[PDB]
Each structure stands twice: as structure tokens, then as C-alpha cells.
Amino acid sequence: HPDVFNILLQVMDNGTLTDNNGRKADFRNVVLVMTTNAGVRETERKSIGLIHQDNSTDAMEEIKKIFTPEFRNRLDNIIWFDHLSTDVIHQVVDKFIVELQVQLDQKGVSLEVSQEARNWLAEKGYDRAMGARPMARVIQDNLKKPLANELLFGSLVDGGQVTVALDKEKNELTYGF
Amino acid sequence: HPDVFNILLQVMDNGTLTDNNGRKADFRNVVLVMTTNAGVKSIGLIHQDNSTDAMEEIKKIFTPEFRNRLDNIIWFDHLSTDVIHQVVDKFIVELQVQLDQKGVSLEVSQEARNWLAEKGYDRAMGARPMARVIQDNLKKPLANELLFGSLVDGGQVTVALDKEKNELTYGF
Amino acid sequence: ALVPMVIEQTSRGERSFDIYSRLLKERVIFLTGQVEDHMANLIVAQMLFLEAENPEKDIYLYINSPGGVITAGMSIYDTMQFIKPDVSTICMGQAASMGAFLLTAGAKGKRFCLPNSRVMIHQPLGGYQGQATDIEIHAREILKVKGRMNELMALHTGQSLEQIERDTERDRFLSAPEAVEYGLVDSILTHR
Amino acid sequence: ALVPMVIEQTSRGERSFDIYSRLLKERVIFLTGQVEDHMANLIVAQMLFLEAENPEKDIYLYINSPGGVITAGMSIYDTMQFIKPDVSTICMGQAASMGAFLLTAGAKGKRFCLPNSRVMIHQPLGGYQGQATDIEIHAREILKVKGRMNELMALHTGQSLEQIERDTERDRFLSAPEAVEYGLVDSILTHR
Amino acid sequence: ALVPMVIEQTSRGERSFDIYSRLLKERVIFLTGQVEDHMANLIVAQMLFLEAENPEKDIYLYINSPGGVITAGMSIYDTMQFIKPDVSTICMGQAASMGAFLLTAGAKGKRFCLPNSRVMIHQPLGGYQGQATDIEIHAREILKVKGRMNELMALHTGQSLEQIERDTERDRFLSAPEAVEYGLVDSILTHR
Amino acid sequence: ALVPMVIEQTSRGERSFDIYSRLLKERVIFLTGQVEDHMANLIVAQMLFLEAENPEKDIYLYINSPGGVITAGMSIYDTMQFIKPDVSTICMGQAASMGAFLLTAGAKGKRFCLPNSRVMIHQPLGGYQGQATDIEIHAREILKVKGRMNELMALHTGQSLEQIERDTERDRFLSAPEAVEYGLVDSILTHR
Amino acid sequence: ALVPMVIEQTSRGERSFDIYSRLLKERVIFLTGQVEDHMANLIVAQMLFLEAENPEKDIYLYINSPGGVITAGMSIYDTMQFIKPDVSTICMGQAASMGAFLLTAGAKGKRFCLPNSRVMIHQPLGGYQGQATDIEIHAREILKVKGRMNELMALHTGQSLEQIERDTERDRFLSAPEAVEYGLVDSILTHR
Amino acid sequence: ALVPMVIEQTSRGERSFDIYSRLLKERVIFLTGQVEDHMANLIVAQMLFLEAENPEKDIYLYINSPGGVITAGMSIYDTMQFIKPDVSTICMGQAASMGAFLLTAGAKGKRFCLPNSRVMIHQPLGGYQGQATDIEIHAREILKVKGRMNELMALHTGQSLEQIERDTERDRFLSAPEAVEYGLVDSILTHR
Amino acid sequence: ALVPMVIEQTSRGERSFDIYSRLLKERVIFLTGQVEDHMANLIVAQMLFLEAENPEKDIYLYINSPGGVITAGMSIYDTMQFIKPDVSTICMGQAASMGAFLLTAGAKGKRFCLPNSRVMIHQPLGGYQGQATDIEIHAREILKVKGRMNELMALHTGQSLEQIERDTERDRFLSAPEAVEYGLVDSILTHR
């Protein structure tokens, strides 16, 4: 509720906050980070015409609409996060594959994923509008499904050495011991 | 508002409204009386106006479906000169008993009664201005003479028309 | 646009009408320019609606016309005669042959005119081109029309038929008092 | 604009119609000016809508027309004959060949006219320019049209076909009583 | 469109009027261009509505006209004289014969003009073509009209009838101070 | 305005449509005047919308046209053939070459006409000015068009191609019974 | 239509104005095309409304005109002088004799022009046809008008009357810096 | 008015659109009459809006045009090429030089035509009057335009450039099957 | 009507705009047909409103014009230079002398054109009739205008003043790549 922002006004300006018991909380040693999805609609909204505009001005307009001038005045900075590029997508895929490998090692299953398989996963999952979250689902369906089957009623019961590689005729994945 | 009409129709249909706390408003012992004017300064070269049609104007939201809930359609017409004289007499006897309860007799000349009826009644406004005209023309000088102390018990006032001033001539 | 809008507060308020509709609501109708088919038909529609509104209240037809076709004027006159409420014709500006006729055709005792208004009357005009037989037919027809107009004028003004016949032989102009004395109008409107 | 708006209170009130729509709501239709394709088609649409509204209530067609094309008049006449409710034609102003035909084509017993209205009838007009063969074709076609018009008039008025043929050879004008006696109309409207 | 709309907040707010309707709401009326039947009738309708609104408050008629037909001007003048509230005529731009007449016809003490406005007066114009008898009739009629105009001008300005007659023989232009001295207007508007 | 508005009560009531939109809501379309690009395109849009509304219910095209350009008529005919629902063409008034073609192109068993309607058919008209080669090109093109029209008419009426060719050499008029016997229409509408 | 609508959110939001009304709300008025009676009267109405809105805030009259009639320009000039708030005239495009005069008539210190705008001034034009006496009358009248225009220009620009007289003998064009040096405008608008 | 309104129930229901707006909502655009600046600009605006609505869904441009100016057609063609979604051109009625070009410029595999539609192509027309040097300049310009048109047609139809050059030397008409074989359209629409 | 309406859902939804207002909401403006006073003033009003909306976002002026009067183009150019946000001019169709000038006057780095668009430039046209002195005055004025136009073009394109002078002596047409190389536009728009 926009009425809640006034508490943050008081805190950001004075670093103190008085609860119901007259007790004052000390915020001087607390980092205050607030995450929003405001103004995103305009930035991704397509203008009508031959040339599209930078809607970052509209993002600023929307943020100013939502946050009163003094609230914007009591901020250290507003960090405008950008979308994720394709190489960033590759790195995100590497990160998620590492996490999946840790999960598998918890079960005692080593896993190797080829490089072109990583590239293919990134190409399949890259979605500019949704950032890095689609990569989680893509990796999930493309790897965990056969892996879950092999860990439940398959070869990878108390054993690993699962290799995943990509062919070029069907863009499919290898598996098995 | 038409929603008020829907509520009134609910009542006229079953006579039971539900309080928002779950209580039942029983209308079986309530007589429903609703009024409507549907009446009307004549742009142009005249000042003519006399007309009545309320069936078309409530048939608006009181559609024939709604009108089928009406137990009776009571019609009222304009007031004739004799009956405006009679309501003037009603007001006059009311003020008369009011004053006699203090010991002051009041007589209004007949032409003064006719003048009061002509000044207080308006066809487009009915007998509503009559209350104010009667009060202002009668009680006012009486109020003066009574509070000042010159008109006291044993006194009286004879209201007659000043034919050329139109003021209600009076006396002790 | 060219016709300004007005605001009226009766039931919900802010009832926006054009000025002509705002006056039609007060049972007053304007007749201007030449009398033709469409304008006369509009006048007839307005008169019928006003009759359906209240057949007892008068209808005021403000006439300012340099004439027109005899047939449309006859339509308006017949509509005025047929309807139950009285039609009070007020001649402002000027009223020529058809306009003057429609003016004098108002309800008896309610034909008015303004002090500087002008009234002109004359025999109907027309013509035809073609064969001799068709010429004769059209001539007899227009003569019947002229006779009917003279009869109606003599009826509405009280003058003798021969008087109207000898008067409307040429264009005859009449001021407001001359019109009152002639019988075309009942009285002259002066002030409120 | 030129056509004034009116206010009607039926269900929610303040129902603003133009005057022509306000009268069409009362099952009355106006026919003015020349009869052409678009105007006649508008009349046909109005008649169809009025039939769909209440096939039992009469429809009143106020006719004031100097004529028009025979084909559009035939369309209107066929629409009048086809629809179930009765069409009461009222001739105010004047009604020429096509207008007079559409007037006399009203429901039997409901063809009226106003006391000063004028009625004129004549054989249909036309022509063509071109080769002799096309000339003959168009001449035979217009003669068939004339014969059909005479047959329909003799049917609707009760006169003999030879009587209509010898009467409409030239322009023939008829007053209101002459029209009543001829059979074009049933009676003359005088007063409320 | 060409006429801009404005917003007014009285009861519910955001009352959108065209500028002319927005000023008519303030009892001010504009008279521009030539004086003809329809425009003068519009002015008459506005004046009648303003009288019905408040018969005590003045009505302001801003006049800027190169003239017009005498009859429509006479209609406007008669409407101004008849209505109860006072009509304050303000001549901005310029006012020719009919415009100047309607200007000087304002309520006594309330005829104003602007410092650079121009006023011109002259005898009425006209004419006719036809037979000698009709020529004589129309000539006598226009002479009566000229006499009536001179009488009304002498009445409203206070000048002698012979003075108006000898002055309006030709086009006579008057500046704002010349108009004030002549008596056409009461004073010149300078500043707020 | 010229086209009156009507009121319909379906869901909230007081649904104000113009008369043409009110009838289009009932899946009836009017075709009047000459057939040109914009009017035919309007008809095509209406037919497409009516198909999208209910591809099973018939569509009624009331035809009254003195002809038009062959190309717009071909557009309308192709749209009628393409859409799934049946198009019932009703010829009231009259239907010339393009109008008659669009009439006979209705759904088999649903081509009607009114008892006094007129139907005329002829070979398509045209022309060109320029060099001899372009003249020959345009002549061959119009001859191909004429052949295609004759083929389509022979298909829709059931007559032989040679019969249509020898019939439409000149203007050929057909009454309602003649049209029924010829095969252009299926039956004549008489009464409800 | 041709004039696009815009949306504004002040109290309830979604306040749809045409662009011209949307700018009039910001106390800016456009003067384009020739200066005639109706357009100048519209400008006068807008100025009066803007004065009634806030008599303290300035009014901006964007001038782009090839001239017009002297009388309508005089009306606009008198309205500008009379009203209390200051009128800032901005000449974009070009401003001819009447347009240039209305431009230089702005509030002292607030007459602007755009860097490529053009300004042209000349003696007023006119004429008359008729008898010698009327010719002389109209000539003296137009000479008085020319003298008054020269006096007003010398007043508003600060130049000598003889300087204006010798300058406006013929068409004299002025660029933006030439206009600033001449005194017609106060400064040239360059950037925000 | 002339364009009927329709009703659609999506969110609140009773969404009244004109028929053209109702179809534009379905991503279908009409191109009729001559191709000129304003109409082509309207088409461009509609195409841009439809692209902004859903860049993946096709856009259907129903073409029925006797030609137009080459520049407006080039604007439409460039807009069709630039936008991401595919433009399916459907030629109903007929499509001349500019219309045929815009038809064949549709998305490959989606250029349709109706069985009786006509297609005509020819070299662009033009001209100029003036000095010899300007004549030469304009001639070279129109020759460059003709070459560019031939190149684009050869690209979109797959025919050789020399084939298009020798074909469009004169007016060349094509039926629907001839157009399919020539490559202008992909297939002929027959039935649902 | 001719301009279709569209629906937009932002706050309450179902926001009905005409297509031109719907695009103006997206800070895109169309310039079509000849450049005249009223159209250029409309463009200026739109640009001022768009600047007041967001002085940081660009404004897109889609230019398709065969020229116009130099003064209105100068007004548009001055408005483009004055406002803070950048004006991106896109030439689709074609842009003649005034249109080409307004195109090249866009924000540096944002002047685009479409691959088949045409650009033509030439010295300004004009003329005058009258006395020798006025002839000389008008000639010197138009020569100053031509010099100013050449200076502005040399500034915006980067070419030498002598180059522009020798190039625009006659009508010079430029294709899209020729325009890019000449410096009138920055790049050619090809695809999304």
C-alpha cells in the first residue's frame, strides 16, 4: 500500500524507527535494499511506428508516479537493472548446471555436459523478456526428466557417469552410464 | 434511482426487506404512499402552462410491470377559488384559536380573506406559499403589538384590507 | 456550430438543446425563408408533435417569409386547421403572399404582428410551357388555385370575396396598422 | 441542426430523437420531393421496420410529392401491398403522377386527402436515344409500363380501364372533392 | 472543429460548451456578417431565451456587420424593443446601415462603441424589374421603408428628422467620437 | 439527420441504431443506385460481417439498381459465392444489367422479385480511346468479360449459352412473371 | 477527424479535447489565414474568455496571417487593448499588413518573432465603384483609415509618423532582425 | 450515417464500432478507389497499428483499386516490406497498375485473388511541361521509376526482368487463372 | 467515418481514439499533401503538445508532401528547431522542395527515408504582378528567401553553399541512396 512508504521515509531519513512500545530501532548499520518491477511495462512496450523509442524516460515517469518526490529524495540511488545478454545467458546456464551437478553429487551421481550441449540449451531457453528464469525450466525439462527417471527406475541408481552430448541431425541429448 | 425502484418493487411484491444484519423488515402492516408531481416561464410570447401526465413519467421506471404492484392510483387536482378560500379559513381559525388562547380576538374582513387566498395560493405551487403569506401578513404586526405590550389581554385586532395599500389594516 | 446550444435544468439538469429545439420545447415554431416542400414538412412534423404533446395549449408560429410554393403553404394551412390546439401566428420581419396567408390563417383572435413588420399579398404566380391543350389545363388549374386562395382569405379576414379579388390583383403592401384594419391580424404586439 | 431534436419520457426519460425519428416511432412516414432510388429505399426500410414492430397497427404515409421515377414508386407500391398492416396514405400539399398513384394505393377505406390538397395524374414520361431497334424496344417497354399503371389505377379507384386511359392522356388536376368523387381517396380530413 | 470548446465547473464540472454557447450563457450575443433571415432569426431566438432566463439582467449584442436586408434588421429591432430587459449594443469592428441602426437601437444610455470602430449610415437600397405599375408599387413601398427608418433613427438619436434625412442621403462614415457626438452611441469603451 | 434513428431493447434497452444498421442487425442488406467501388466494398464488408456472425443463417440482399461498373458487381458476386451462408436476393423497384446479374446470382431457390419489379439485361458496355493496339487489347478484354458474364448467367439461370447470347444482344426488359419463367428468379413475393 | 483529439488528466482524467481547445486551455490562441469577420470574432471570444479566466496571466496570440480586412483586425486590436491581461503576440511563419499590425500591437516588451519569420507592412487597400460623390466619400474614409493605422503603428513601434508614412508607401518586407531593429517586435525567440 | 454501426460483446458488451473499424479490429484492411496521399497514409497508419498489436498475426489487405499515384503505392509497399507480420493481399473486384503491384507485393504464398477478379498492369504514366532541361530531368526520373517498378515486379513474380519489360509495354489484362500462372498471385479463393 | 476508430486499454480501457489521435499519443505526426497555413499550424500545435508531454522523448514526423508554401514550411522548421526534444523526420512516399527541406531539417543522426522514397529539391517559386517598383521589391524579397533556404540546406546537409546553389537551380530528384550520399538523410530504413 502506498501509505506504507512513509515508514520508509522516516527510516531512510533518520535511520531510526519507533515501534508500538516507544522503543526505537536503529537502522544505521542496516543496508536497505528494495526490489521492484515497476516501470517495466513501458520499457518493454512497443511503440507504434517505424522507429522504437527508449522508454526509460517512461520508466522514470512511472517510478516518480509511484514514489513521492521526497521518497525518491531519500534514496541513495535507483539502480536500473538491464536485460540479460546471450553470453550472460551462457554463464547463467553454466551456473545452473553447476547447481544441478551439486544436487546430483548429493545423490552420488557425477554428471558431464558437453559445451555444444550448453550452447544448445542457451539457444533453446533464451528469452529476453523473462531474463534468467526460463533457463531454469529449460534445464529442468531437458536434464532432470531423464535424470529423474534414471534415478528412480533406471540406470543411475547408486551410480553416475551420465554423459550428455548434442547431435546435429536431431539436436538431441545423450545419456546413460 | 432505478435501484430504489427495484427495492420498492421487492417490497410491493413480498413486503419483506432484509436488514444487512440479518433482520427482517416486515412491511405487512405498512401502508406505502408515494407522491409524484410530473408538472412544470414559457419562453416566447405567452405565459400558458397547465398539463398532467404522470403515468408516462413513472411508467418510465414504474413500468407496467412495476405499475402492476400499485394498489390504487390516487389523483389530485388543482385547488378552486372556493377551496383556497376554505383553506384560508382553516389557517385563519387556527391562528384564531392560537390567539384566543391568550385573550385576543381576531377578525379578518372577507375581502381580506379573498386577498390572502389570492396572494398565498399559486397554481404551479399549490397551497405551499400560503403558510408563509398567512404567517407574514397576520402574525407580524400582531407579534409587534403583543411583545411591545400595547396589545395585551382584553385587546383585539380587526383585519381589513387597505383597498389602495393592500396592507391588512388593523386596530386595538 | 452555427446554431448555439443551451442548457436547461428540469429533471437531471444540463439538458443540452440547440436553440431551435429549446424553443420548440416551449411550443414555438419558426417559419423563415421561402416555403418549400422539406421546410413545410418539417413545420408540419413539429405541429403534429406539439399537438400530441398537449392538444390544449396554443402553438406559436413565428412567420418571416418572402413567400414560397403555394402547395407547401396549403399543406401547412391544412395542418393548422386540422389540429385541435390553436395556432397563434406572429408576423415579424415580413410576410409575403404565402407567408401573409399563413399568418392570417392563425386562430381567430390570436393573429399578431410587430409594429414595424410588413405584409404583402398578391395573386399566386406560376406558368407552363408546352402544347396549347396542356397550357389551357394548367391555366384553369392555377385559376382554380387563385379562386380557392381568395375564398380562404375572404373567410379568414372577413372581407368580401370581391374585395380580396380587387385588392390582390397587384402586389399590395400593408403596414402593421393597415394589416390590423384590413383584418389580416388581430392586434399589434408592443411591449411586455 | 436544421432538423430539431425533441425529448420523450418513456422508460428512463430524456430520449432525444430528431423530429422525423420521433414521428416514425408513431408509425407515420413522410414522402416528400421527387421519388428517387435512395429516398424510396429509405421509405421501404421504414415500412419494413414498422411492419416488424407491430404487423397489426396501421402505417401512415404522408405524401407530398411532385412525382418521380416510376420504378421507385413501383418499389414503394409493392412494399405497401406486400406488408400485412394497412397503409393509410394522406395527401397533403400536392401529389403528382407517382405521388398520386402511391396515394390511391393506400388501404381501401383509408386513403385521405386534405381540403386544399391538389392531385394530378398523367401517363408516364420517358424517352430514349439510339438505334431504331433499341428505340422500338424502349417504346414497347414504356407502353407496357403505362398499361400496367393504368390497370393498377383502375383496380385501386374502381374506374374502368378505358376511363383511366382516356383521363390520363393529358395532365388532369383534381381538387380534394374531385378526388373523392373520382375514387382516388376515400374521404377528406377536415378537423379533429 | 473550427469553433473551440471550453470547460466550465458549476454543479458537476467539466461542462463542455462551444465558445459561442459559453458566452451566450453570459447573456452576450454576437451579430456578424450580413444580416439575413436565418442569422437574424437565430439572434431573435437567443434574445427570447435570454429574456426567459432573467428578464431583469441586461443583454449585450456585440455588433460587427457590413449591413444586410432591412427586414431581418427590423425583426431584430422589434425583438429588442419588445423584450423587457435592456439590450446593450456594442459596436466593434464596424457597423454599416443595418448594423448601425441596430447599434443605435440599444437601450438608452447603454449604446457603446470601441475607440477605433467605424459607423456608416445611408438610405436603404433596393430595386425592382417589371411593369410600370409594379415598379411604382415597389418604389412607394421602399420610400415608406426609408421614411420609417429615418423616423426611428431620429427617435433613437434625438436628431431632427430633417437632419437624418439630409445626412443619410449618401454614405456617411462616423468615427467613435463622431458617433458619440451624433448621438448614435452613448460613450466609448476605453479600458477595464 | 436524413436517416432516422430507432430504439431497440435487448440487454440494456434503448439501443439507438440508424435504420440501416438496425436492419443489418437482421441480416438484410440494401443495394441501391449505381454499383461503384466504394458502395460495393461496403456491401462486401457487410456480407463478411454477417457471415462471421452466423455462417448458417441466410443473408438477404434487397436489390434496386440501374446498373454500375462490371468489376464492382463481380466483386459482390464473388463474395456471395465464397461465403458459406446462402444469399437471398430480392429485386424490388428494378434491377438493370449489373443489378439483374447480382439478383440472379442468389442462392438457388431463394431468388425472389416483387410483382411490379422490372428486370433488364444487356451486354456490358465500355470503350476506349487511343492507339490501335491498345484499342484491340481493350476490345479483346471486354469481349472476354462479356463471354464470362454470359457463361455465369447461363449457369445461374439454366438457359443455354447461345440463348443468353442471343437474348442480351440488346436491352431486354422482363416483368416479374417473365423473369420467373426465364429463370432469373425462383418465385414472386405476393403477401405475408 | 482532421483535428486530432488529446487526453488530459486533471480531476477525473481522460479529458478529451481537440488540440486547439487543449491549447486554448493554456491561454494560447492561433490566428491563421486571412483576417475576416467570423475568425476575428472567434479570436475576440477566446480573448474575452481567457480574460474572464485569469485577468493577470498573459495571453499568447500566435500570428501567421497573409492579411485580411482592416475592420476585423481593428476589432481584434481593440479587444487586445481593452482587456486587462497582457497579450504576447508571436509571429511565426509570416505576418502581412493586418497580421503585422496585430503582431506589433502586443504588450510592450512581449512582441516576439521567430528567426525565419517574415514581416510585411503596407498601406491599406480597398476601392469603390459608383458615382463621383460616393467615390469621394469612400476615398476620404479610406484615407482616414490609413492615417489612423499609421498613427497606431507609430505609437506601437516608437517610430515617427512621417517614418511610417514613407515606409508603408509600398510593400516593405522585414526579416526577424530587421523587425527587431524597426521596433515591430521586442526580441527573437531562439531556443528553450 | 452512410457507414453502418455494429455491436460487439467482449468485456462490457455493446461495443459500437463502424463496420470498417470493426473489421480493422480483425486485422483486415481495405484499399479502394485511386491510391492517393491521404488514403495511402491512412493505410500505412492502420498497418503500423496492426503491427504494434500483434507482430506475429497476418494482415489482410483487400485490394480493389483502379490505380493511383506511384509514390503513395511505393509508400504502402515499403510499409508492407518493413513490418514484421506477413501481409496477405486479396484482390477482389479489380486491381490496376498500382493496385496490381500492391497485390503482388504480398507475403509470398499468401497473394490471393477471387475467381472473377481482374488484374491489369502497365508502365507508369506521367508527364511534364516546361523547359527542355526540366523535361529531360523529369523524363530520366520517370524512367528510373519505371525501371524500379519492373525490378520489383520481376522480384515478386519470379519472371525475368525482360519478360516484365516486354509485358508491361502496354495495358495487359489478366484473369484470375492467368494471374496465378503469371505469378502475381499464389492461388484463387473459391469457397469456405 | 472515413477515419477509423481504435480501442486502447490503459486505465479504464476501451479508450476510443481516431487512428491519427491514437498515433499522436505515440509521439508520431503525419505531414501529407501540400504545406499550407492551417495544416502547418496543426503540425505546430501537435509538436508543442508533444514537447509539453515529454521534452526528452523524440518526435517522429512522417513526411509525404509534394511541397507547399515556403512560409508554412518555415513555421514548421522554426518550431522543430525551437523545441527541446529531437524531431526524427521519416520521408515515405516522396518529399518535394518544402517537404524535402523539412525532412533534412530533422535531428542530426535521425533523418531517415524509405528505400523507394523519392526526394526532390529546387529553388522556391513565386511571382507578382503590378508596378515596376513593387515587382522589384517582391523580387528582392524572394531572392532573400532563396538565399536563406540555401543557407539552411547547406547547414543541415553539410554541403557547400555554392554546391546547394548549383544543385537546386533546377528540379533535382534523388533516390534513397542518393539522398543518403547527398546528406539529406542519415540512413535508409530497411526492416525491423
The DSSP result for H113-154, as a single string, is E-TT-EEEE--------S-HHHHHHHHHHHHHHHHHHHHHHH
Torsion angles phi and psi, residue E60, rounded to 5: -110, 120
C-alpha distance from C128 to closest chain D C-alpha (Å): 12
Contacts of residue A47 in chain H, CB cutoff 8 Å?
A: 52
Regarding beta strands I15-18 and I5-8, do their DSSP bridges make them parallel or antiparallel, or are they unpaired?
antiparallel
Query: Crossing angle of helices C70-82/C97-104, nearest 10°?
Result: 10
Residues 6+ apart with CB under 8 A from C22: B43, C6, C8, E45, E49
Residue E55 CB: number of other CB atoms within 10 A?
12
Contacts of residue E83 in chain C, CB cutoff 8 Å?
A: 192
The DSSP result for chain G, as a single string, is --SPEEEE-SSSS-EEEEHHHHHHTTTEEEEESSB-HHHHHHHHHHHHHHHHH-TTS-EEEEEEE--B-HHHHHHHHHHHHHSSS-EEEEEEEEE-HHHHHHHHTS-TT--EE-TT-EEEE--------S-HHHHHHHHHHHHHHHHHHHHHHHHHH---HHHHHHHTTS-EEE-HHHHHHHTS-SEE----
The reply to whether residue I22 touches residue A48, judged by beta carbons under 8 angstroms, is yes
Look at residues H11, G4, A58 and name the one whose alpha carbon lies nearest to residue I13.
Answer: H11
Regarding beta strands H5-8 and H59-65, do their DSSP bridges make them parallel or antiparallel, or are they unpaired?
unpaired
Cα-based distances in Å from B46 to C58, C90, C134, G52, G138: 9, 12, 50, 35, 47
Strand partners, G120: G173
Rg of chain I, C-alpha, whole Å = 18
Boundaries of domain holding F138: 1-192
The DSSP result for I31-52, as a single string, is EESSB-HHHHHHHHHHHHHHHH
The reply to whether residue H116 touches residue F82, judged by beta carbons under 8 angstroms, is no
| CA–CA dist G43, G31 (Å, integer) | 8
Cα of B99 vs its chain's centroid, Å: 22
CA distance from start to end of chain G: 31
| CA–CA dist F30, E18 (Å, integer) | 38
| CA–CA dist A139, B66 (Å, integer) | 67
Look at residues G167, G191, G170, G169 and name the one whose alpha carbon lies nearest to residue G179.
Answer: G167
Q: Tell me the one-letter amino acid at F143.
A: L
The cell for F179 is 423473369
Query: Crossing angle of helices H70-82/H37-53, nearest 10°?
Result: 10
Contacts of residue D39 in chain C, CB cutoff 8 Å?
A: none
Q: Which helix (H) or strand (E) holds E32?
A: strand E28-32
Cα-based distances in Å from B166 to B110, B118, F45, I45: 14, 12, 78, 67
Torsion angles phi and psi, residue D126, rounded to 5: 175, -155
The cell for F162 is 447461345
Residue A129 DSSP class = G
Do residues E79 and E44 make contact, with C-beta atoms less than 8 angstroms apart?
A: yes
Torsion angles phi and psi, residue A16, rounded to 5: -125, 155
The reply to whether residue C15 touches residue D20, judged by beta carbons under 8 angstroms, is no
Cα-based distances in Å from H145 to G108, H78, I116: 56, 15, 9
Cα of A9 vs its chain's centroid, Å: 28
Name the structure determination technique: cryo-EM
Regarding beta strands G5-8 and G15-18, do their DSSP bridges make them parallel or antiparallel, or are they unpaired?
antiparallel
| CA–CA dist C106, C153 (Å, integer) | 11
Do residues F14 and F7 make contact, with C-beta atoms less than 8 angstroms apart?
A: yes
Residue D52 CB: number of other CB atoms within 10 A?
12
The reply to whether residue E117 touches residue G148, judged by beta carbons under 8 angstroms, is no
The DSSP result for H41-97, as a single string, is HHHHHHHHHHHHH-TTS-EEEEEEE--B-HHHHHHHHHHHHHSSS-EEEEEEEEE-H
Q: Which of left, alpha, beta for I112 (phi over 0: left; psi -120 to 50: alpha)?
A: beta
| CA–CA dist H175, H186 (Å, integer) | 13
Does residue E40 sit in helix, strand or coil? helix
Q: Which of left, alpha, beta for E109 (phi over 0: left; psi -120 to 50: alpha)?
A: left
Residue with cell string 481593452: G82
| CA–CA dist D99, D65 (Å, integer) | 5
The answer, for B59 touching chain D at a CB cutoff of 8 Å, is yes
Cα of C31 vs its chain's centroid, Å: 7
Cα of A25 vs its chain's centroid, Å: 32
Torsion angles phi and psi, residue I39, rounded to 5: -65, -45
| CA–CA dist E43, E63 (Å, integer) | 11
Q: Tell me the one-letter amino acid at G135.
A: I
Resolution in A: 3.3
Please tell me the total count of domains within chain F. Answer: 1
Look at residues C71, C75, C66 and name the one whose alpha carbon lies nearest to residue C120.
Answer: C66
Regarding beta strands E59-65 and I59-65, do their DSSP bridges make them parallel or antiparallel, or are they unpaired?
unpaired
Do residues I41 and I20 make contact, with C-beta atoms less than 8 angstroms apart?
A: no
For an interface test with D, the pick among C56, C74, C98 (most D C-beta atoms closer than 10 Å) comes out as C74
* CATH of residue E19: 3.90.226.10
Cα-based distances in Å from F65 to B94, D37, E146, F120, G167: 82, 8, 57, 10, 67
Do residues H29 and H46 make contact, with C-beta atoms less than 8 angstroms apart?
A: yes
The three-state (H, E, C) secondary structure of chain C, written as one string:
CCCCEEEECCCCCCEEEEHHHHHHCCCEEEEECCECHHHHHHHHHHHHHHHHHCCCCCEEEEEEECCECHHHHHHHHHHHHHCCCCEEEEEEEEECHHHHHHHHCCCCCCCEECCCCEEEECCCCCCCCCCHHHHHHHHHHHHHHHHHHHHHHHHHHCCCHHHHHHHCCCCEEECHHHHHHHCCCCEECCCC
Do C and F make contact, counting contact as 3+ CB pairs within 8 angstroms? no
Contacts of residue B46 in chain C, CB cutoff 8 Å?
A: 58, 60, 88
Does residue F125 sit in helix, strand or coil? coil
Do residues F162 and F156 make contact, with C-beta atoms less than 8 angstroms apart?
A: no
Residue C125 CB: number of other CB atoms within 10 A?
11
| CA–CA dist I47, I85 (Å, integer) | 10
Look at residues E34, E9, E11 and name the one whose alpha carbon lies nearest to residue E125.
Answer: E34
The DSSP result for chain D, as a single string, is --SPEEEE-SSSS-EEEEHHHHHHTTTEEEEESSB-HHHHHHHHHHHHHHHHH-TTS-EEEEEEE--B-HHHHHHHHHHHHHSSS-EEEEEEEEE-HHHHHHHHTS-TT--EE-TT-EEEE--------S-HHHHHHHHHHHHHHHHHHHHHHHHHH---HHHHHHHTTS-EEE-HHHHHHHTS-SEE----
| CA–CA dist G26, E6 (Å, integer) | 11
Does residue E104 sit in helix, strand or coil? helix
Query: Crossing angle of helices G70-82/G132-157, nearest 10°?
Result: 40
Q: What residues 38-67 of chain D have any CB closer than 8 A to a CB of chain F?
A: 38, 40-42, 44-46, 48-49, 52, 55
The cell for H20 is 470498417
| CA–CA dist F100, F94 (Å, integer) | 8
Question: Which of C23, C58, C90 lies nearest to residue B48, judging by beta carbons?
Answer: C58
Strand partners, I113: I91, I188
The cell for H7 is 455491436
| CA–CA dist D192, E151 (Å, integer) | 47
Rg of chain B, C-alpha, whole Å = 24
Residue G116 CB: number of other CB atoms within 10 A?
23
Q: E-strand spans in A4-127?
A: 16-18, 24-26, 111-113
Q: Which helix (H) or strand (E) holds E90?
A: strand E87-95
The three-state (H, E, C) secondary structure of B59-118, written as one string:
CCCCCHHHHCCCCCCCCCCCCCHHHHHHHHHHHHHHHHHHHHCCCCEEEECHHHHHHHHH
Q: Which of left, alpha, beta for I131 (phi over 0: left; psi -120 to 50: alpha)?
A: beta
I86 labelled catalytic: no
Residue C131, classified by CB atoms within 10 Å of its CB into exposed (0-12), middle (13-18) or buried (19+), is exposed
Question: Which of E20, E79, E144 lies nearest to residue C4, judging by beta carbons?
Answer: E20
Residue G147 CB: number of other CB atoms within 10 A?
12
Residue I108 CB: number of other CB atoms within 10 A?
9
The reply to whether residue H11 touches residue I6, judged by beta carbons under 8 angstroms, is no
Strand partners, C89: C61
Do residues H96 and H112 make contact, with C-beta atoms less than 8 angstroms apart?
A: no
Residue with cell string 513555421: I75
Contacts of residue I22 in chain A, CB cutoff 8 Å?
A: 48
Rg of chain C, C-alpha, whole Å = 18
The cell for C111 is 393573429
The cell for D137 is 424496344
Do residues E121 and E101 make contact, with C-beta atoms less than 8 angstroms apart?
A: yes
Residue H96, classified by CB atoms within 10 Å of its CB into exposed (0-12), middle (13-18) or buried (19+), is buried
Residue A165, classified by CB atoms within 10 Å of its CB into exposed (0-12), middle (13-18) or buried (19+), is middle
Do residues C88 and C59 make contact, with C-beta atoms less than 8 angstroms apart?
A: yes
